[PDB]
Amino acid sequence: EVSQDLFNQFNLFAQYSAAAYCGKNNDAPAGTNITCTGNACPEVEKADATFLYSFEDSGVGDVTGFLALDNTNKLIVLSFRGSRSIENWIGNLNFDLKEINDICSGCRGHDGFTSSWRSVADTLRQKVEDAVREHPDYRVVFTGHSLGGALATVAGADLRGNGYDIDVFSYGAPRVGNRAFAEFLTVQTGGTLYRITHTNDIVPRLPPREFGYSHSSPEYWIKSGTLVPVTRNDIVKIEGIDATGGNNQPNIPDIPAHLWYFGLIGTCL
Amino acid sequence: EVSQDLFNQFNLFAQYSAAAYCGKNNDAPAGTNITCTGNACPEVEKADATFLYSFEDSGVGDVTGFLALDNTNKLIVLSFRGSRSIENWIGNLNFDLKEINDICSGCRGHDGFTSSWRSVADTLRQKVEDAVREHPDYRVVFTGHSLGGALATVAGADLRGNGYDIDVFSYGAPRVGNRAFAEFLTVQTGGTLYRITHTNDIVPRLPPREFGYSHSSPEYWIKSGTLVPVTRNDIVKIEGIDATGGNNQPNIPDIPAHLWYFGLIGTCL
Ligand SMILES: *[C@@H]1O[C@H](CO)[C@@H](O)[C@H](O)[C@H]1NC(C)=O
Ligand SMILES: *[C@@H]1O[C@H](CO)[C@@H](O)[C@H](O)[C@H]1NC(C)=O
């Protein structure tokens, strides 16, 4: 049972993550109001929120997402899309580590996640830092769902400690690297990671521990079912690197539990 | 407002309808339990419900669906699936009316729906008859979403007067014919038709009245939004053939609304 306030944040960032997919982003004018089809992001529409910068298919991993300004909640939000076809994406998921000491020493991250980030880091840090400058009081937040949540967790770890806090809200994210990296994500200051999971979501279960992956702590695990509305009492905080008892349990995972975090996500009606 | 009992019924056949898309029944042997992927039909799984006969791309209409026995609720249910790509189905939809006197007098119905039913009518009539025999105590219900709603509405109108009531629950069904058919279905005995629409769903708005089509009365209009749960208080009964101020408003219509009838329908997580 998280607080009402944290619940509201959870829900708002689920929707900014869903907006990565169901917005009418493509590349629409900077300064445009953010809206989603299919009632995907009503809390965001409600907010005085607008695009700062959209990207589609940037660099090495065709990274897709947007950078938003939200004057109602006083946020600068960097939201990364997951894949356009999650099932194929999962099927083809590579498990290779590559070194990332320039984030933290001893750290190995998922090779493709880190390479996709790496290849757009400069442009995006620049875009964030710009925005930080025009709104020094606003909270920087990176968010995303699935591969999106992955990217946002890497960028956040890479980009923290340069003056401004970076909070990360991630929705059903895969593991992003090795245990050293796990540990760093669990303690790193200058921003809290809120790693959100749903029931038996298949995505937070890849890559598996077996290929040398860990999950940061803590873990916010939604226990209400697919297509069931979430209340504060369906969310459970789970402590311990690689703790079991939220998403990380020995049962059959599900793709549909992946697509329901507070509402429909990773897909667009 | 509708009664709770009525609301329970509406919800249950919304799921039987949803099961026509997300059940695992392609060649499911007769007698299998009915189950769905993605929490699409929990009230159905919860009942002792099993298949009687599954069909797929049957006859001229490529009509798909199933006939089910439900011992808990004492039903025999014939469920027709809508189109596999509803957006296409929508823009490919012609407005051609055919005479259908062999169902009512001066009745004009949509050409494709009427034909598709017509070519599978005898096989299925047989199979409903068999179960009515085997379970004389059980209510016969025809149900469907979208296309499946138009089919079910047509079969019901076609197979009533033969000694067992047939009730029809349609979900976001299109218009099915001409003011005389709209009248036939308003008044016919041997059954009730429960014609359920959602907010500004587009399909109940097609074909247009401006191509000679009318809607049977009454209409149960769901006011609550897309991805919003429905309560008995969010359903309004709208009286009068082509009444307006339910789904029949001149505002701008929407496709996602079509995919949310009590829960997700017409697509499968
Ligand atoms: C965008 O929404 C803001 C308030 O959040 C509003 O003032 C503005 O007019 C809206 N723009 C359009 C084009 O609808
Ligand atoms: C099918 O459902 C019945 C009653 O609803 C149940 O008791 C039976 O075990 C089920 N069969 C399977 C394979 O689950």
Write the layout of secondary structure elements.
Two copies of one chain form a homodimer.
Chain A: H1 4-22, H2 42-46, E1 49-58, E2 63-70, E3 75-80, H3 86-91, E4 97-99, E5 108-110, H4 111-134, E6 139-145, H5 147-159, E7 166-171, H6 179-187, E8 193-198, E9 219-222, E10 235-238, E11 260-261, E12 263-264
Helix pairs in contact in A: 4-5
The structure holds 2-acetamido-2-deoxy-beta-D-glucopyranose (2 copies).
Folded structure, characterized:
The first copy, chain A, has helices at 4-22, 42-46, 86-91, 111-134, 147-159, 179-187; strands at residues 49-58, 63-70, 75-80, 97-99, 108-110, 139-145, 166-171, 193-198, 219-222, 235-238, 260-261, 263-264. By secondary structure, chain A is of the alpha/beta class. The first copy, chain A, has one domain (1-269): Rossmann fold, CATH 3.40.50.1820. In chain A, the strands form three sheets. In chain A, strands 1-2-3-6-7-8-9-10 form an eight-stranded mixed beta sheet, sandwiched between helices. Chain A has a two-stranded antiparallel sheet with strand order 4-5. Chain A has a two-stranded antiparallel ribbon with strand order 11-12. The radius of gyration of chain A is 17 Å and the shape is globular. One 2-acetamido-2-deoxy-beta-D-glucopyranose binds next to loops of chain B. Chains A, B: It comes from Thermomyces lanuginosus (Humicola lanuginosa).
